[PDB]
Each structure stands twice: as C-alpha cells, then as structure tokens.
C-alpha cells in the first residue's frame, strides 16, 4: 500500500508535469482559454498530492514500527521454545515425585 501511494504520488507529479507542458503549448497557441483550463487542473491535483503526502508520512511511521515489532516477536518465540523444554522436564519429574510421595 505504501509503495502504491508512492507510485500514485509519482503519477500525480507526472500528471502535473504533463499539464504544465500543455500550458506551455497553449501559450504558444495564444489562446487564453486553453491556458486557463490547464492551470485549474494543476491546482486541484496539487492539493490532493499534499494531502496524500501527509497521509503517507503517517502510514510510513506506522509501518516502520510494525517492522521493529516483528523483530521483537521473533526473539520472543525462540525464548518460548527454550522455556517449554525446561517446563516439560520439570513436569515429568513432578509427576513421578507425587506418586512416590503417595506411597
């Protein structure tokens, strides 16, 4: 999703550049109306891009935190396996001891 937003942002920038090229062509043409339409398209797109960038930054921070969390999780599962082995040995000994105690 983060990659897609970045691609979308790049596409938006490309679209703005395309509009700018059209505006330059309009200036050469000398028609005022054609140039004005291109400018309007650029402004709305720019506003959308700014909003997207802010959203992307927040999303990126969350993603980074998740990656860090995943690394911590990997350490935890490994620790659990070691704990399980210790627990199993203790349990077997305890069961045997209880039977002996009963006699």
């Amino acid at each position: 999703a983060q990659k897609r937003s970045e691609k979308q942002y790049n596409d938006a920038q490309n679209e703005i550049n395309k509009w700018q090229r059209n505006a330059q062509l309009a200036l050469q043409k000398g028609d005022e109306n054609l140039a004005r339409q291109a400018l309007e398209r650029k402004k709305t797109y720019t506003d959308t891009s700014a909003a997207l960038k802010a959203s992307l930054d927040t999303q990126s921070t969350q993603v980074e935190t998740l990656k860090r969390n995943l690394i911590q999780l990997e350490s935890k599962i490994s620790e659990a396996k070691t704990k399980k082995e210790m627990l199993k040995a203790r349990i077997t000994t305890a069961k045997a001891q209880e039977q002996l105690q009963g006699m």
Binding site: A23, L27, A35, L39
Partner: peptide
C-alpha cells in the same frame, strides 16, 4: 498571473 508569466517568456 499566467499571462504575465507568459509575457516574460515571450519577452526574451
């Protein structure tokens, strides 16, 4: 504003 910018480009 666009016209003014266009005029400057035309100038040179």
């Amino acid at each position: 504003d666009e016209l003014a910018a266009l005029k400057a480009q035309m100038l040179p």
